[PDB]
Ligand SMILES: Cc1c(Cl)cc(Cl)c2nc(CCc3nc4ccccc4[nH]c3=O)nn12
């Protein structure tokens with residue numbers, strides 16, 4: 001237990017910043033995650049052997065899809081790491097433990113298709129989980145991996161601490177259904193403005209963690225422009241494949257998923273920043289001031305999409 005994970009100097013310094021990109025070396029991603037657990041939680045939070053075995057089963061249960069893959073999982077965990085490290089004293093020991101795991105697991109066994117496409121295809125998961133279909137599946141895959149021999153990283157917790165941490169993870173993962181984000185953020189906006197927001201109220205904390213999960217999930221829009229732009233290419237590679245699968249079912253896909261409407265992407269990105277990303281990081285910054293760099297980076301990326309529309313890119 002005297003085994004610190006360390007990182008080369010550039011990674012050691014840059015991992016602390018919100019805009020860090022975990023890089024193209026897949027074999028370094030498990031080490032990067034353990035490094036983040038050790039610093040945001042402690043070398044004592046998890047047994048190394050169990051944690052390592054859990055990480056590698058999680059990786060194996062992400063598919064080789066263009067965007068909703070193992071790289072996305074670690075990227076979303078790093079954004080959470082950055083939020084937790086900039087808000088040291090606001091989070092409980094169980095929240096520290098639960099949230100990095102929730103982020104690593106939040107898209108487990110994603111197939112590259114929306115809840116909407118599973119409902120239209122009539123996939124078995126759509127009959128098992130009528131709303132937040134993929135997100136209920138991701139939580140289900142998380143419990144399955146935690147129950148494999150030698151994979152229970154929470155085995156040192158009491159029965160009630162264990163139930164609390166799995167409840168934090170379930171809610172965090174469900175919150176990554178962007179259909180739920182709009183109402184969650186509106187409620188948080190009203191509570192912050194009327195001054196009713198109270199972090200001792202468990203159902204208020206739940207809403208704030210939900211928004212943190214949206215913020216981490218969307219964190220592609222908070223990177224250096226070349227990261228943002230190249231990640232958008234992966235996002236559309238998925239959306240357009242789903243669009244193709246919609247046309248195979250005899251359904252005109254929405255424009256966001258129709259590869260024949262590529263020309264509309266820059267304006268689609270503008271809508272997305274204005275309707276989803278900017279309001280997400282605005283409310284997050286109001287509640288947790290030290291997350292302001294996420295909002296500032298998002299606004300810089302919106303200005304870059306504006307440049308793309310004006311033909312200056
Ligand atoms: C960057 C990013 C993240 Cl991080 C996560 C998610 Cl879910 C996401 N979805 C989009 C697509 C936005 C979008 N493109 C469109 C393209 C063409 C026509 C209409 C569109 N209408 C849209 O709304 N970008 N995106």
Ligand SMILES: [Mg+2]
Pocket residue numbers: 106107134176177
């Ligand atoms: Mg998801």
Ligand SMILES: [Zn+2]
Pocket residue numbers: 072076106107176217
């Ligand atoms: Zn995700």
